Design a protein around this ligand. Structure first.
Ligand SMILES: [Zn+2]
Ligand SMILES: [Zn+2]
Ligand SMILES: [Zn+2]
Length: 106
């Protein structure tokens, strides 16, 4: 309900994830008032030309209302990798890593 989160799309100093629920930003629901109560459902995955995308939602373990929506997208460009995340709860973040054909991933 947006009142579920302390901050809307908090920055994570570059952290981009396809899993979990950010309990440190979740202040507990406002449809029912419960905390440390959540599930994940409708989890989709997409892949275009080397880019990998993961989209999902968070649901209150008590009232099963949709707490928030999550998106994580990952792209490979020429010699580098790009990571981006956007979630009302988990946060908004972006990172880029330079790599080699030896696949070292820093
Ligand atoms: Zn809520
Ligand atoms: Zn709730
Ligand atoms: Zn999230």
């Amino acid at each position: 309900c947006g009142d579920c989160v302390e901050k809307e799309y908090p920055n994570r100093g570059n952290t981009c994830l396809e899993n979990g629920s950010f309990l440190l930003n979740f202040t507990g629901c406002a449809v029912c008032s419960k905390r440390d109560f959540m599930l994940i459902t409708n989890k989709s995955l997409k892949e275009e030309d080397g880019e990998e995308i993961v989209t999902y939602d968070h649901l209150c373990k008590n009232c099963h209302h949709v707490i928030a929506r999550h998106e994580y997208t990952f792209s490979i460009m020429d010699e580098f990798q790009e990571y981006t995340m956007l979630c009302l709860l988990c946060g908004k973040a972006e990172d880029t890593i330079s790599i080699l054909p030896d696949d070292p991933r820093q």
